[PDB]
Amino acid sequence: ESYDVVVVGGGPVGLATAWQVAERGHRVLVLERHTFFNENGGTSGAERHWRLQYTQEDLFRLTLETLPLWRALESRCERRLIHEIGSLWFGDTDVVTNEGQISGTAAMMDKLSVRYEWLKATDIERRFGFRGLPRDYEGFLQPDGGTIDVRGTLAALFTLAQAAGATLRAGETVTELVPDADGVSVTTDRGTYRAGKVVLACGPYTNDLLEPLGARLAYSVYEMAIAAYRQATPVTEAPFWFAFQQPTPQDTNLFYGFGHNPWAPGEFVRCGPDFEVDPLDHPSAATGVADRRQMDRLSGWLRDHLPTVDPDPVRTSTCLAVLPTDPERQFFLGTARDLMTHGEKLVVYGAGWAFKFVPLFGRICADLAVEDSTAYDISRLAPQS
Numbered sequence: 001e002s003y004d005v006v007v008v009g010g011g012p013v014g015l016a017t018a019w020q021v022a023e024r025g026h027r028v029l030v031l032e033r034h035t036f037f038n039e040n041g042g043t044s045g046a047e048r049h050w051r052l053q054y055t056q057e058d059l060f061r062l063t064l065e066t067l068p069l070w071r072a073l074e075s076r077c078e079r080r081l082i083h084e085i086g087s088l089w090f091g092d093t094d095v096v097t098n099e100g101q102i103s104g105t106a107a108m109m110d111k112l113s114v115r116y117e118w119l120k121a122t123d124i125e126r127r128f129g130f131r132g133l134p135r136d137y138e139g140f141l142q143p144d145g146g147t148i149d150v151r152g153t154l155a156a157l158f159t160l161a162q163a164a165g166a167t168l169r170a171g172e173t174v175t176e177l178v179p180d181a182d183g184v185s186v187t188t189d190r191g192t193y194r195a196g197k198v199v200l201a202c203g204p205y206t207n208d209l210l211e212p213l214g215a216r217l218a219y220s221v222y223e224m225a226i227a228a229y230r231q232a233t234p235v236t237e238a239p240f241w242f243a244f245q246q247p248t249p250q251d252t253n254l255f256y257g258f259g260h261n262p263w264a265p266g267e268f269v270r271c272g273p274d275f276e277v278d279p280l281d282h283p284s285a286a287t288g289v290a291d292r293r294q295m296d297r298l299s300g301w302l303r304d305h306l307p308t309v310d311p312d313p314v315r316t317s318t319c320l321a322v323l324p325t326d327p328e329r330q331f332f333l334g335t336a337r338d339l340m341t342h343g344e345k346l347v348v349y350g351a352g353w354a355f356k357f358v359p360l361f362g363r364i365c366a367d368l369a370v371e372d373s374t375a376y377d378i379s380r381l382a383p384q385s
């Protein structure tokens with residue numbers, strides 16, 4: 001068979017891309033090795049954080065440009081997907097993390113006229129229920145950030161893509177890509193295809209298809225523990241939070257919580273460590289069982305520092321984080337033009353904290369696949385070998 005665009009991967013980025021390509025009238029196929037809506041990749045769990053604020057100006061401009069794309073998606077599917085519970089960042093204000101740097105981000109919020117409330121340790125403890133914070137911990141609340149309904153977003157994208165004519169095929173694994181001057185040959189475990197262009201939206205598996213073409217992107221894959229905790233004390237404010245700390249010799253020493261869940265039964269909140277440790281050689285090494293040390297660290301930090309939750313988790317899971325190895329890079333998004341001959345026929349989304357960007361990155365991957373250019377400024381994000 002032949003298509004204008006073949007999308008490898010049916011996670012949120014692949015689905016958003018297919019929606020955008022199909023609604024523009026092009027023939028698109030999505031190939032997903034497992035099932036749509038699976039929780040074995042980078043998109044597990046119910047919640048992700050929406051935030052405006054970024055340490056990097058170009059990415060901050062992109063969140064501001066993505067907000068209307070979320071509102072458009074919400075209107076198309078008749079479901080609110082972002083719930084503005086707040087974005088709370090606190091801790092050591094100078095440490096640089098994969099989340100950003102507090103001090104630099106506050107200066108960027110000042111620059112871009114984005115509102116926030118600055119908080120001292122006593123204010124954080126009083127308002128949000130944290131305890132035992134070091135006296136020099138400080139940060140801010142950005143009240144327009146909040147929580148994204150992951151499963152609602154996926155269902156919306158699936159529905160929109162299919163309604164627009166995309167072919168969504170699960171249980172099929174892409175095993176080889178060979179771009180040439182005339183298009184791209186796609187081989188799977190079930191057959192072969194020709195494509196005008198291919199979009200790689202395959203999460204941690206990107207390098208499997210790039211390495212036979214002589215390319216490899218510099219990302220690391222981490223099997224991160226996520227766990228659900230019962231809210232023990234009712235609270236007035238329950239934002240997303242992220243604790244910025246200096247690393248320890250053993251781990252990155254960062255913790256977060258997705259905050260109040262406005263659509264779910266009960267009163268459970270998800271928290272996790274954000275640890276850049278024990279990168280997987282290959283995603284096939286994932287166990288799908290929350291790492292014991294990560295869980296001891298997470299529950300132990302919550303036990304002391306967020307006693308509004310019961311620190312004995314009611315459920316645990318994993319999620320695969322895919323992050324640039326270079327801390328100066330946040331995302332890989334672009335074509336493979338610089339990576340291989342005929343690489344412009346491969347559009348790649350390759351690493352980062354991207355759920356907040358799903359409507360944007362789908363639109364950009366569609367732009368690159370069908371119009372060979374995008375209006376958005378993503379120069380810095382271009383793929384890195």
Ligand SMILES: *Cc1cc2c(cc1C)nc1c(=O)[nH]c(=O)nc-1n2C[C@H](O)[C@H](O)[C@H](O)COP(=O)(O)OP(=O)(O)OC[C@H]1O[C@@H](n2cnc3c(N)ncnc32)[C@H](O)[C@@H]1O
Pocket residue numbers: 008009010011012013014031032033034035038041042043044047048049050172173174175201202203204205224225226272319320321349352353354355356357
């Ligand atoms: C894991 C994680 C991520 C995360 C986060 C916290 C954790 C612990 N918090 C975030 C947040 O608060 N805000 C945010 O903006 N992002 C956050 N993230 C990141 C986000 O979850 C991921 O960036 C995003 O969900 C990734 O989506 P993407 O569509 O890129 O990737 P995926 O869900 O892994 O899907 C890829 C699919 O491809 C299929 N696959 C893989 N190989 C093949 C081949 N060869 N053939 C066919 N299909 C293939 C996979 O099965 C998968 O479904």
Ligand SMILES: O=C(O)c1ccccn1
Pocket residue numbers: 049051099242256274353
């Ligand atoms: O992008 C974010 O804001 C994010 C990423 C990882 C963990 C929590 N939040």
Ligand code: NA
Pocket residue numbers: 261262263264265266267268
């Ligand atoms: Na509830």
